Design an enzyme around this catalytic site. Structure first.
Site, PDB file in Angstrom:
ATOM      1  CB  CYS A   1     -39.267 -33.068  25.643  1.00 25.15           C
ATOM      2  SG  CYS A   1     -37.944 -33.688  25.271  1.00 25.15           S
ATOM      3  CB  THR A   2     -37.646 -30.427  30.005  1.00 26.00           C
ATOM      4  OG1 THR A   2     -39.175 -29.949  30.290  1.00 26.00           O
ATOM      5  CG2 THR A   2     -36.957 -29.309  30.811  1.00 26.00           C
ATOM      6  N   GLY A   3     -35.678 -31.110  27.764  1.00 28.66           N
ATOM      7  CA  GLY A   3     -34.145 -31.320  27.205  1.00 28.66           C
ATOM      8  C   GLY A   3     -33.777 -31.611  26.005  1.00 28.66           C
ATOM      9  CG  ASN A   4     -34.192 -31.660  21.403  1.00 30.40           C
ATOM     10  OD1 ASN A   4     -33.542 -30.996  20.405  1.00 30.40           O
ATOM     11  ND2 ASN A   4     -35.235 -32.377  21.001  1.00 30.40           N
ATOM     12  CB  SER A   5     -33.417 -35.853  26.529  1.00 35.40           C
ATOM     13  OG  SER A   5     -34.400 -35.331  27.305  1.00 35.40           O
ATOM     14  CB  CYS A   6     -36.803 -39.003  26.504  1.00 37.98           C
ATOM     15  SG  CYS A   6     -35.367 -39.431  27.351  1.00 37.98           S
ATOM     16  NE  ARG A   7     -40.933 -36.438  28.379  1.00 38.47           N
ATOM     17  CZ  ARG A   7     -41.305 -36.055  29.367  1.00 38.47           C
ATOM     18  NH1 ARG A   7     -42.550 -35.980  30.008  1.00 38.47           N
ATOM     19  NH2 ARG A   7     -40.468 -35.401  30.279  1.00 38.47           N
ATOM     20  CB  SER A   8     -38.719 -33.562  21.644  1.00 39.42           C
ATOM     21  OG  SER A   8     -37.476 -33.449  22.340  1.00 39.42           O
TER      22      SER A   8
ATOM     23  CB  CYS B   1     -43.686 -22.991  25.184  1.00 38.78           C
ATOM     24  SG  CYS B   1     -43.528 -22.931  23.418  1.00 38.78           S
TER      25      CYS B   1
ATOM     26  CB  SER C   1     -37.086 -32.400  18.366  1.00 37.85           C
ATOM     27  OG  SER C   1     -35.773 -32.998  18.090  1.00 37.85           O
TER      28      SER C   1
ATOM     29  CG  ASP D   1     -30.377 -28.876  18.022  1.00 40.02           C
ATOM     30  OD1 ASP D   1     -29.141 -28.565  17.915  1.00 40.02           O
ATOM     31  OD2 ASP D   1     -31.023 -29.743  17.484  1.00 40.02           O
TER      32      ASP D   1
ATOM     33  CB  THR E   1     -28.240 -32.348  17.258  1.00 42.39           C
ATOM     34  OG1 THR E   1     -29.011 -31.468  16.486  1.00 42.39           O
ATOM     35  CG2 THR E   1     -27.149 -32.789  16.538  1.00 42.39           C
TER      36      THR E   1
ATOM     37  CG  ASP F   1     -39.101 -37.612  32.365  1.00 44.12           C
ATOM     38  OD1 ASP F   1     -38.295 -38.086  31.529  1.00 44.12           O
ATOM     39  OD2 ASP F   1     -38.977 -36.296  32.687  1.00 44.12           O
TER      40      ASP F   1
ATOM     41  CB  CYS G   1     -42.783 -32.593  29.265  1.00 43.17           C
ATOM     42  SG  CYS G   1     -41.552 -31.418  29.265  1.00 43.17           S
TER      43      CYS G   1
END
Ligand code: K
Length: 130
Positions: free
Chosen positions: A9-16, A88, A35, A64, A62, A104, A81
């Site tokens: 996912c874009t910022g390796n924050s929520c979804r991933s 990618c 992830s 990454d 983390t 999101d 996303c």
């Protein structure tokens, strides 16, 4: 022996991060789950809390950036996303890629954050059945 799935996912924050948490539990038998993201936004505290509710600990995860060696060894790279799908990097020929689009959850009300978490559970359960 064990296969490898890579959730992006874009910022390796929520979804991933939630997908990695669900993946390690549901697909843990014959799968190595990782992830990454195009950018690093940090592990969202709401994602940690969302997973704690379903008794899955992702607090040691983390945020990454995408690693070329994990990409090389991946059996499936899953983009979560639109931005992550389009940006990618060029994947190795033997590595498969699939886009599993989810809304999101960051910026959405807390109930909708939990909904995205459970939609991810369902997609991973369906994947195990392939
Ligand atoms: K990660």
């Amino acid at each position: 022996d064990k296969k490898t799935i890579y959730f992006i996912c874009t910022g390796n924050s929520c979804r991933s991060q939630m997908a990695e948490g669900w993946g390690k539990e549901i697909l843990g038998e014959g799968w190595n789950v990782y992830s990454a993201g195009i950018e690093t936004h940090g592990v969202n505290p709401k994602a940690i809390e969302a997973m704690k509710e379903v008794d899955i600990d992702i607090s040691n995860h983390t945020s990454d950036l995408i690693d070329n060696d994990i990409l090389k060894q991946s059996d499936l790279v899953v983009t979560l996303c639109s931005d992550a799908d389009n940006n990618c990097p060029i994947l190795p020929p033997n590595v498969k890629k699939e886009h599993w689009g989810f809304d999101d959850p960051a910026g959405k009300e807390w109930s909708e954050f939990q909904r995205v978490r459970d939609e991810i559970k369902l997609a991973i359960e369906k994947f195990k059945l392939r």
